[PDB]
């Protein structure tokens, strides 16, 4: 939003999001253990998002 | 298994200009294979079959020189081998008095010396090679046909080389070095963490040394693998193509040297990949045999650390102490409740201002005790979330060692100790807030004491009225 | 922001970009003004009408960035999301009072800006079970409340040493 709204550069942002909000986002709990407990396979998902940003 | 390695044959050297690659296995250069394929080339015609006689003798002489030079590098190779066997086995290192960094230092020195003996004696071998393939250049300048001769031997040798390329298994080597590389880089990272974790550095020194040697083996295996794949791909690139029937002498010479160089690279390559495969699997077995000695000590650190982190005995001190204060508060409170219930009915509205003082302090009493109850409820709530963290770690810790696969077990123990390292960040805040509520309990204990003393002097007052 | 660990990860990433052999790797630095905690704990308390005795709720680990350093007493009104639509359908007047909202649907700064526009005096923000199902009810979180972006003490011009601050 500062890039697009301020400087006038076309900007993009994308997430593999879930229907409900991610519960502990700016909290003290957010760590790799609760992450990999939440998303059971992480390497394929981040593999896909890195593939999109490569494209 | 065995703590030491049998074959020391993976060490190698090439010339400084990168023009010639040597090896430890027979016949230590690829261009000898090029001279054997050139020898069946020389058996194909007559003008060059006089030369298959001649360089039969010559290449045999060069083979004797290379074998003798490798013999001198055998009597150096034992001097390297002893320094390997000191470093790989921990108790064999524990017998001597010499420290680790000095023995690794002399190991580097003797490795450079061994590599030096193969280098220099093979330099004299390379002077012999330049004489030989110079006379090979004289052969394909010696041929009687200037542009008469055909391309039939070339395409036939495309066919023979193509079937031999169809013979060899490439994909299992490829997937093999991918799997072994992935396990290797994972091993380097987990040894890097576990170095800072564990206490005893002897085993971790031997492991780290074997990691270095394994990395050297992996790089050699990649070099021979990529060279084999490039050779087969270039031969299929020749196997595409537009076919000529008539050739001049100079270009046919370049074609023959090209394809002969290619299959020579191949037949050297599969042998090098074979030996590197075998010794590589042996070193993998050694690193298994060391990590198996490590994980029992690692489990002792985990069991020590779980009691340390989650702040448990201090917490139970806070909870039992706070419930003790609640018990004393209800005890002295009820002990005065009978006299208070007499004191409220006693005055008969005789006094007003001090009655206002009384029901001030009474409401302060009741609301204070209920506030103590809500405080204790909060403390026990934060504590049960903290214990829920701990029992999540223990419930993982039960199902970790049931797997038993001798290399991932260290990784799961490192994963769980990494999980307590994650959990500290939030557990600290829980314990902090429990300390704050206990400070509140102390202040309310002071208030309930002075209020009860006030009520005692108050009943003395209304008894005076 | 600006802690020592951030500089360790910083020199780690710059060390990586140097190691990947990019065509040019370069570093820039600024000097900004942020909002951090102090020694005195910020807290929230039920005050009785009598004022005789004091009840603690918690000493929360979280803090909101760019809040005003103050202390307020007053009544508390639930203000579901603080959206303008959610303020227009509100039963009670909002002036001279503290609002409590639950986290979601908009940034913190638009909640504080809207409740400031209807002349409230303070904002408490939580997260609850229906939107955020978490096992423990004890963890605390972080947010900034600056409407708009940027270093707020240099609007429009950059925060270098050249601009004299
Ligand atoms: C650039 O501006 C910064 C302002 O952040 C100056 O750094 C501060 O200077 C004051 C006065 O000497 C001291 O508090 C510290 O030396 C600096 N503060 C911090 C937090 O680092 C700085 O001197 C200016 N000039 C240069 C050349 O950097
Ligand atoms: C809000 O403050 C007081 C208290 O409710 C009230 O009298 C006043 O009219 C309200 N509005 C403004 C703009 O002050
Ligand atoms: Ca700015």
- Evaluate whether B276 touches B218 at the Cβ level (below 8 Å): no
Roughly what angle, to the nearest 10 degrees, separates helices B353-399 and B249-309? 140
Of B371, B430, B436, the CB nearest to C138: B430
With H, G, I as helix, E, B as strand and everything else as coil, classify residue C137: coil
Q: Do the Cβ atoms of C61 and B360 come within 8 Å? A: no
What Cα–Cα distance (Å) separates residue B417 from each residue in A28, B193, B297?
A: 19, 11, 13
**Helix ranges restricted to H, B149-248:** 152-167, 171-197, 201-238
- Evaluate whether B327 touches B448 at the Cβ level (below 8 Å): no
Task: Tell me how many residue pairs between chain B and chain C have CB atoms under 8 A apart.
Answer: 37
| Alpha-carbon span B419 to A33, nearest angstrom | 6
State the virtual CA torsion across C146, C152, C153, C158 in degrees, nearest 10: 170
Of A20, A23, A26, the CB nearest to C143: A26
Contacts of B217 (CB under 8 A, 6+ apart): B10, B276, B279, B280, B283
| Alpha-carbon span B442 to B321, nearest angstrom | 10
Which residues from C are below 8 Å from B430, CB to CB?
138
Strand-strand pairing, C122-126 and C143-144: unpaired
State the virtual CA torsion across B293, B298, B304, B305 in degrees, nearest 10: 180
- Evaluate whether B367 touches C53 at the Cβ level (below 8 Å): yes
Q: Omega before B43 cis (within 30°)? A: no
Q: Where are the beta strands (DSSP E) in B261-332?
A: none
- Evaluate whether C27 touches C17 at the Cβ level (below 8 Å): no
Ligand 2 within 6 A of CB of C95: yes
Question: Residue C139's closest CA among C127, C125, C123, C130?
Answer: C127
Task: Out of C77, C92, C95, C115, give the residue to mutate to test ligand 2, the one with the largest number of ligand atoms within 8 Å of its CB.
Answer: C95
- Evaluate whether B221 touches B180 at the Cβ level (below 8 Å): no
Burial of B86 (0-12, 13-18, 19+ CB in 10 A): buried
Count of residues in chain C: 165
Among chain B residues, CA nearest to C52? B364
| Alpha-carbon span C69 to C66, nearest angstrom | 9
- Evaluate whether B133 touches B31 at the Cβ level (below 8 Å): yes
Of A28, A29, A33, the CB nearest to B419: A33
| Alpha-carbon span B426 to B261, nearest angstrom | 66
- Which method was used? cryo-EM
Question: Residue B227's closest CA among B267, B193, B176?
Answer: B267
Among chain C residues, CA nearest to A7? C156
| Alpha-carbon span C32 to C40, nearest angstrom | 23
Q: Where are the beta strands (DSSP E) in C2-158?
A: 44-47, 54-58, 64-65, 76-78, 98-102, 122-126, 143-144
- Evaluate whether B150 touches B250 at the Cβ level (below 8 Å): no
- Evaluate whether C131 touches C102 at the Cβ level (below 8 Å): yes
Distance from CA of B422 to the nearest CA of A (A): 7
With H, G, I as helix, E, B as strand and everything else as coil, classify residue C100: strand
| Alpha-carbon span B284 to B45, nearest angstrom | 50
* Ligand at shortest distance from the CA of C92: 2
> At which residue do the structure tokens 């209920």 appear?
B370
Beta-carbon neighbour count of residue B449 at 10 Å?
13
What Cα–Cα distance (Å) separates residue C24 from each residue in C13, C17, C27?
A: 14, 9, 10
DSSP classification of residue B14 = B
| Alpha-carbon span B386 to B318, nearest angstrom | 14
Which residues from C are below 8 Å from B441, CB to CB?
none
* Ligand at shortest distance from the CA of C164: 1
Beta-carbon neighbour count of residue B272 at 10 Å?
24
What's the half-sphere exposure (Cβ side, CA atoms, 13 Å) at B286? Answer: 27
What's the half-sphere exposure (Cβ side, CA atoms, 13 Å) at B409? Answer: 20
Q: Do the Cβ atoms of C53 and B381 come within 8 Å? A: no
CATH architecture of the domain with residue range C41-165: 3-Layer(bba) Sandwich (3.50)
| Alpha-carbon span B35 to B31, nearest angstrom | 6
Output the CA C95–ligand 2 centroid distance in Å. 6
Q: Measured on CA atoms in the order C108, C113, C116, C120, is the torsion positive or negative?
A: negative
Torsions phi, psi for C57 (to 5 deg): -90, -65
Start-to-end C-alpha separation, chain C? 20
> At which residue do the structure tokens 């003008």 appear?
B47
Beta-carbon neighbour count of residue B177 at 10 Å?
19
- Evaluate whether B197 touches B301 at the Cβ level (below 8 Å): yes
Ligand 1 within 6 A of CB of C160: no
> At which residue do the structure tokens 């002075």 appear?
B450
| Alpha-carbon span B128 to B357, nearest angstrom | 118
State the virtual CA torsion across B143, B253, B243, B49 in degrees, nearest 10: 50
DSSP string for residues in A15-42: ----SSPPSSSSBS--SHHHHHHHSS--
> At which residue do the structure tokens 């940034």 appear?
C107
Burial pattern B192-223, b for ≥16 Cβ within 10 A else e, equals eebeebbeeeeebbbbbbbbebbeebbebbeb
Instruction: Name the closest-CA residue to atom 20, ligand 1.
Output: C31
Q: Measured on CA atoms in the order B108, B109, B112, B117, is the torsion positive or negative?
A: negative
Torsions phi, psi for A27 (to 5 deg): -110, -175
Which residues from B are below 8 Å from A32, CB to CB?
422
């Amino acid at each position: 939003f500062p890039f697009l709204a301020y400087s006038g550069i076309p900007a993009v942002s994308f997430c593999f999001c879930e229907d409900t909000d991610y519960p502990y986002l700016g909290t003290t709990m957010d760590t790799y253990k609760e992450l990999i407990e939440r998303i059971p396979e992480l390497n394929k998902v981040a593999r896909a998002a890195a593939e999109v940003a490569g494209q | 298994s065995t703590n030491t390695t049998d074959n020391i044959d993976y060490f190698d050297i090439s010339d400084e200009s990168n023009y010639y690659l040597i090896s430890q296995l027979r016949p230590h250069f690829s261009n000898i294979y090029f001279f054997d394929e050139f020898k069946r080339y020389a058996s194909y015609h007559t003008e060059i079959k006089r030369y298959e006689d001649i360089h039969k003798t010559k290449v045999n002489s060069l083979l004797n020189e290379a074998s003798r030079a490798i013999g001198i590098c055998n009597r150096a190779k034992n001097t390297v081998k002893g320094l390997i066997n000191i470093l790989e086995n921990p108790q064999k290192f524990k017998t001597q008095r010499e420290s680790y960094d000095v023995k690794l230092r002399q190991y580097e020195e003797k490795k450079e010396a061994f590599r030096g003996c193969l280098l220099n004696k093979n330099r004299k071998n390379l002077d012999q090679i330049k004489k030989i393939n110079n006379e090979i250049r004289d052969l394909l300048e010696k041929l009687k046909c200037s542009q008469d001769c055909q391309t039939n031997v070339y395409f036939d040798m495309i066919k023979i080389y193509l079937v031999d390329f169809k013979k060899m298994p490439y994909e299992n080597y490829d997937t093999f070095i991918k799997q072994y590389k992935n396990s290797y880089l994972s091993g380097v990272d987990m040894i890097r963490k576990i170095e800072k974790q564990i206490d005893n550095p002897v085993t971790i020194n031997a492991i780290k040394f074997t990691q270095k040697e394994m990395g050297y083996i992996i790089d050699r295996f990649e070099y021979h693998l990529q060279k084999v794949k490039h050779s087969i791909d270039q031969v299929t690139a020749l196997s595409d193509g537009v076919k000529p029937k008539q050739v001049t002498k100079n270009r046919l010479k370049e074609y023959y040297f090209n394809i002969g160089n290619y299959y020579s690279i191949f037949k050297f390559g599969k042998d090098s990949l074979n030996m590197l495969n075998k010794a590589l699997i042996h070193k993998e077995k050694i690193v298994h045999n060391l990590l198996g000695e490590l994980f029992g000590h690692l489990e002792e650190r985990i069991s020590k650390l779980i009691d340390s982190e989650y702040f448990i005995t201090e917490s139970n001190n806070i909870i039992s102490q706070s419930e003790e204060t609640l018990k004393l508060a209800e005890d002295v409170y009820d002990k005065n409740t009978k006299l208070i219930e007499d004191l409220t009915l006693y005055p008969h509205l005789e006094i007003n201002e001090f009655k206002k003082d009384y029901d001030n302090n009474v409401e302060d009493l009741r609301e204070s005790i209920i506030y103590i109850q809500s405080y204790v409820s909060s403390i026990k709530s934060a504590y049960r979330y903290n214990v829920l963290e701990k029992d999540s770690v223990e419930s993982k810790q039960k199902n970790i060692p049931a797997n038993s696969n001798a290399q991932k077990k260290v990784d799961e123990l490192l994963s769980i100790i990494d999980s307590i390292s994650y959990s500290n960040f939030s557990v600290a805040e829980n314990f902090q807030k429990m300390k704050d509520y206990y400070k509140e309990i102390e202040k309310l204990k002071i208030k309930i004491l002075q209020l009860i003393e006030a009520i005692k002097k108050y009943q003395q007052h209304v008894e005076e009225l | 922001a600006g802690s020592q660990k951030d500089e360790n990860l910083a020199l780690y990433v710059e060390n990586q970009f140097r190691e990947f052999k990019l065509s040019k790797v370069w570093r820039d630095q600024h000097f900004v003004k942020i909002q951090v905690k102090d020694s005195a704990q910020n807290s929230v308390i039920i005050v009785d009408k009598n004022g005789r005795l004091v009840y603690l709720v918690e000493n929360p680990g979280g803090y909101v960035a760019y809040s005003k350093a103050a202390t307020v007493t007053g009544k508390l009104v639930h203000a579901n999301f603080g959206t303008k639509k959610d303020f227009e359908d509100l039963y009670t007047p909002v002036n001279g009072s503290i609002v409590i909202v639950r986290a979601g649907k908009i940034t913190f700064a638009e909640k504080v800006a809207n409740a400031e526009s209807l002349n409230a005096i303070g904002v408490l923000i939580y997260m609850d079970q229906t939107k955020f199902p978490i096992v423990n009810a004890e963890l605390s979180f972080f947010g900034h409340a600056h409407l708009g972006t940027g270093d707020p003490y240099t609007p429009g011009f950059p925060s270098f040493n050249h601009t004299q601050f």
